[PDB]
RNA sequence: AGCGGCCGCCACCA
RNA sequence: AAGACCCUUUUGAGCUUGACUCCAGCCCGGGCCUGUGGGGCGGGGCCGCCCCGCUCACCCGGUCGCGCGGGGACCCGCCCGGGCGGGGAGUUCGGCUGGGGCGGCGCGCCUGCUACACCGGACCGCAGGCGUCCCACGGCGGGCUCAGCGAGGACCCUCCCGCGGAGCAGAAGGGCACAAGCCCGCCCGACCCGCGCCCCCCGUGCCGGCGCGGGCCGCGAAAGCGGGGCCUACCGAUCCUUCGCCGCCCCGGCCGCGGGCGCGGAGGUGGCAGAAAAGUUACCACAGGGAUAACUGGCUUGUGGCCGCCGAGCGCCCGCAGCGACGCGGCUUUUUGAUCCUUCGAUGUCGGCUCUUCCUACCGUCCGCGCGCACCGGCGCGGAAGCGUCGGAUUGUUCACCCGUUCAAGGGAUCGUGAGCUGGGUUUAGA
RNA sequence: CGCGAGGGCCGCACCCGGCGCUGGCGCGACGUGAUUUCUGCCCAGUGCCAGACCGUCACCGUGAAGCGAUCCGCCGAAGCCCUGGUAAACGGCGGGAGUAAUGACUCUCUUAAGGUAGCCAAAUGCCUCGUCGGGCAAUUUCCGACGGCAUGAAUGGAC
RNA sequence: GUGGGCCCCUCCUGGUAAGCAGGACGGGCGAGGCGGGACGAUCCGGACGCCGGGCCAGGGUGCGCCGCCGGGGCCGGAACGGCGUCGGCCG
RNA sequence: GCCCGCCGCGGUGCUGACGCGCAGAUCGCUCGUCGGAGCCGGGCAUGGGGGCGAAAGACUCAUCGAACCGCCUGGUAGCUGGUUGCCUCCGAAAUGUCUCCCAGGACAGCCGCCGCCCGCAGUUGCGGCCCGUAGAGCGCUGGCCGGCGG
RNA sequence: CGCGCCGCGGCGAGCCCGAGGGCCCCGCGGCGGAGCGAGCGCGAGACGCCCCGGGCCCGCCGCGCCCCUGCGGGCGUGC
């Protein structure tokens, strides 16, 4: 599957159609310091052994691949999904 | 398990040696002021089976 | 052990014993599902209708 | 190896037999330092001096 | 996912 | 004797380890305990290491403290950190299923058929498919016509006719010709905000689709069409994490960091309405189950066994003395399967020995007929169950195989017969 | 196979203990199982071990930034990794084609190595009541030969 | 409360078949007394308070055992055979 | 740590007796051993996931693949058994969906009771639309025996 | 003991033997009376025997327009 450089697609920002360029989404390192976090560290203080579930049936072979799609004029964001695929690569003009 | 014939032994009650009837711990005779300037004189007694 | 899966033998005789039902009568014109546009404009006009007007 | 299970490491089996190697490390616990403890080598051979 | 140079060693709450 | 075999229960226990999660113990490093001096290396513009004296802490020995030593600021101990760790601890070890296991996966979806012309309709029923692929293989407008037959043309070109016999990503079915196929031009409706219905269905969710109100756009002269790829499959809760808006809260105030919250996506549960999980028991279990196997009996009769009908042929000649292919019609329950109705708070489960009674599908003896019947001896058929059908070698054997004799059929009775025996086999615990 | 005592193996909640009234002709851990005759090949896998500090791998400590919480660097013990050794450690020890009725022979694919000396239808051979011979009137038993479903060398082989 | 069903008639699927296994409209037993089918949860009739009289469904009417006479004929199971007997059709 | 054999110590075969016993392991005959890793008495030591074992998972007071005693404890059971007077009025289900679900449940159906309020039908007739089965057939997608004419 | 629904008694925009103090007398909470919103917070009249539906009003999410004390007020529109 290949992607287009740019795109031209509606800005909420500016309420109308503006000209995108692509990149491909990641998610970013866990803080420290989120709420969840700081539950599970605690529970996990002592004798006693893992606290909670760790998952091992793996099943899919892949993961829905999401766009960013940056303004030009305004530096507003927007993600578009894509349908399951093997290999995304954007191109490369502009 | 169980515990094993090696970890029984530590804890002694049948596995402590046999010394009755033995004729004492085998040493050198102590280092005194005598031995350390001159020498001492002694005399074979028995020869006795320990 | 295996037991049976399927029959629908006793259920035609059960779906008759109270009757077949039908529906409120008033689910034959409920508004749900109309063209907003219309439902507007009906609105509208009876409001300016002094013999239906319920405006204070 | 004449023994049942319960009774030693080496214990049990449809033929008597250990299983494993017979070397084990220097830092086995105790229960479990049976055999030839921390061998160099091991075997029949001449050769030496 | 983490260092290194397909290899190693180490990480593991949907 | 509330089956000990077998199965089920979200009932156990002993044992094992490459199950899951951990604990003692041991090894390693820095710190405190902890003195008092002498030196070397390196870095950065004081810091890090390392080395070696002394004795006074601390530690060890000799001695009846009878005329004495050894180590030493290191070891031990303590605090925190890392590694090894079935020695030990706790717990788990899916489901469906013509019993369970091995195997398979109708466990989440899709097409055609089964299915008996509304809808709906079962099986470990039949023939198959899906976990992907495509910035064009997508949107729109214009133009064009495909597969091919026939007939021509130096060693692809032309005409004519052409209902699709081509193509439309991949299963199957359906759909489509100035198009839904092919080529060209311009593009990104493969968008944003807010609702409703259809299928499945308890009229809950999820996948998928459809119809609308309002923004902003693409193509087209325009009417129009466009929320992907013609339609029927191609996928995912709570909690947590991550990112993106526009804001609100941090509760005695105010400011800056940070944390939390309202909305929407992404990271995944294929056992697909979604626990985090390896084996063994011939040492054994508990609750139950004839809802479910191993043995009698019952229904069935493929397989086994026995019996007819027909007449290609064989039999020097001569289809029927004796035979009889290719085909077709039955019977039996002395084989083995198929099934799971009765029995799991128990019907003692192989054979042999002993003893009795029964069947006829008759092997010898009796009475009749037939012959490819001279005699002798054989062979075929009907009636006939009275008497006879034996002694031994090897094998637990039933069976089989040999030797011998007055020359030696086949079966049933809870696979007759264990409070009649025996205990060789199979069938607990030792090896 | 381990250990020279400031040690090794074991006990034990702690303090404190056993071997030890002991010292390598000793103590402790394992395997095989009198004698006679022997004990072959494989260190690739797993296990064990010693010699090197390559990568990885803690807290502590230290540098740079910050209002501070903190963030990012450097430093780097044992272990693993790497280089070797070891089978009376655990264990393992072959295919196809022709060639004078056989096959000394040859070509061939292949392993860490391709089962040596021996023994055998064995208390170990499925096929199987194997084949031949002894013994019997007659033997799925027996003995002797022959040669491997799945014989074989301290898993100790043969006698 | 129930979420083990089963049987009959017609219509089907796997299987040599089965008192085998799996589906469909309607009815039954389950949870339905009484009579009859010798005998049977389901077949043929008929669905039920306690009695007296009458009529009669289904099945039957030698004796067991409640109830019969008249009239016209004839005298478990397959392929395949029969100058047994009575009746036909074609020549 | 030689051989025959008495007491002693043990326990082979009869698969003998007995098997409601003399007995919760005994009796008869037969048998192993009998100067030694031999047999017997008293005192003392080792304590339960522990001991002790010339090793059988053996023995540890008729208890052992984890003793006995009291308590936690009337431990939990989707599983087996039982669950006590009369008459009257009504009256089922053994099916759909989801479930570590398949001997159990929740929601729906079926039924009871309590109500409350002001045309109807498990039927025929007449009218309009829908279906692709039995039969029929070979045009379509496939399959199949032969005979004439160019 | 807690939760749901039904029946009957007393009083009714109210109701009430808490504990306690002097089968009698006095006796707070509480619950009901207003909802909606994560929260800053804002905040219901228009009809009707009864029941059912329609219409409109309040909050939460969005958006025309006008204005004073102003990211504050008013008047509207839409699921
Ligand atoms: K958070
Ligand atoms: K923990
Ligand atoms: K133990
Ligand atoms: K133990
Ligand atoms: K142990
Ligand atoms: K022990
Ligand atoms: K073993
Ligand atoms: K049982
Ligand atoms: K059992
Ligand atoms: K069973
Ligand atoms: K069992
Ligand atoms: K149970
Ligand atoms: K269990
Ligand atoms: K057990
Ligand atoms: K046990
Ligand atoms: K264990
Ligand atoms: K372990
Ligand atoms: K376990
Ligand atoms: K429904
Ligand atoms: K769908
Ligand atoms: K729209
Ligand atoms: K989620
Ligand atoms: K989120
Ligand atoms: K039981
Ligand atoms: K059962
Ligand atoms: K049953
Ligand atoms: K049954
Ligand atoms: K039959
Ligand atoms: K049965
Ligand atoms: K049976
Ligand atoms: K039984
Ligand atoms: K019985
Ligand atoms: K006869
Ligand atoms: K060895
Ligand atoms: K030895
Ligand atoms: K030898
Ligand atoms: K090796
Ligand atoms: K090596
Ligand atoms: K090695
Ligand atoms: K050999
Ligand atoms: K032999
Ligand atoms: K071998
Ligand atoms: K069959
Ligand atoms: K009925
Ligand atoms: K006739
Ligand atoms: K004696
Ligand atoms: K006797
Ligand atoms: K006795
Ligand atoms: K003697
Ligand atoms: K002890
Ligand atoms: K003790
Ligand atoms: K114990
Ligand atoms: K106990
Ligand atoms: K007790
Ligand atoms: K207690
Ligand atoms: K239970
Ligand atoms: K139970
Ligand atoms: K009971
Ligand atoms: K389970
Ligand atoms: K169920
Ligand atoms: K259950
Ligand atoms: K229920
Ligand atoms: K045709
Ligand atoms: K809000
Ligand atoms: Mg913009
Ligand atoms: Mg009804
Ligand atoms: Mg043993
Ligand atoms: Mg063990
Ligand atoms: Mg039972
Ligand atoms: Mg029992
Ligand atoms: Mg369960
Ligand atoms: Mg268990
Ligand atoms: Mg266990
Ligand atoms: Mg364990
Ligand atoms: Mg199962
Ligand atoms: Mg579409
Ligand atoms: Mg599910
Ligand atoms: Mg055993
Ligand atoms: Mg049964
Ligand atoms: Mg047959
Ligand atoms: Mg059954
Ligand atoms: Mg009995
Ligand atoms: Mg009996
Ligand atoms: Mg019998
Ligand atoms: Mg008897
Ligand atoms: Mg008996
Ligand atoms: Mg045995
Ligand atoms: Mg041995
Ligand atoms: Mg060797
Ligand atoms: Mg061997
Ligand atoms: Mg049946
Ligand atoms: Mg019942
Ligand atoms: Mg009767
Ligand atoms: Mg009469
Ligand atoms: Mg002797
Ligand atoms: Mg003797
Ligand atoms: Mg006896
Ligand atoms: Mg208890
Ligand atoms: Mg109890
Ligand atoms: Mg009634
Ligand atoms: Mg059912
Ligand atoms: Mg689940
Ligand atoms: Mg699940």
Redesign the interface.
């Known amino acids: 599957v290949t992607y287009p450089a740019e795109r031209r697609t509606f800005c909420k920002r500016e309420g109308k159609h503006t000209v995108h360029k692509a990149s491909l989404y990641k998610k970013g390192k866990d803080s420290l310091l989120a709420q969840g976090k700081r539950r599970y560290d605690r529970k996990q203080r002592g004798f006693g052994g893992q606290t909670k579930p760790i998952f091992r049936r793996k099943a899919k072979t892949t993961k829905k691949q999401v766009i960013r799609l940056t303004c030009s004029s305004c530096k507003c964001q927007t993600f578009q999904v894509l349908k399951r695929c093997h290999r995304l690569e954007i191109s490369r003009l502009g | 398990?169980?515990?094993?014939?090696?970890?029984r032994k530590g804890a002694g009650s049948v596995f402590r040696a046999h010394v009755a009837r033995r004729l004492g711990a085998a040493k050198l005779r102590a280092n005194d002021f005598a031995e350390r300037t001159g020498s001492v004189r002694g005399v074979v007694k028995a020869i006795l089976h320990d | 052990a295996k037991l049976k899966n399927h029959t629908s033998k006793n259920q035609n005789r059960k779906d008759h014993r109270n009757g077949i039902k039908k529906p409120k009568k008033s689910a034959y014109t409920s508004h749900k599902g109309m063209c907003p546009k219309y439902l507007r404009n009906l609105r509208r006009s009876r409001a300016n209708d002094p013999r239906q007007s319920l405006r204070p | 190896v004449a023994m049942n299970?319960?009774?030693?490491?080496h214990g049990g089996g449809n033929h008597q037999h250990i299983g494993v190697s017979s070397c084990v490390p220097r830092n086995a616990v105790?229960?479990q330092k049976?055999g030839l403890i921390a061998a160099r080598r091991t075997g029949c051979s001449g050769g030496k001096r």
Do not use: A, K, L, S
Request: no cysteine; aromatic share 0%; glycine share 14%.
């Open positions: 398990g169980r515990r094993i014939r090696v970890q | 299970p319960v009774d030693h490491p105790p229960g049976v």
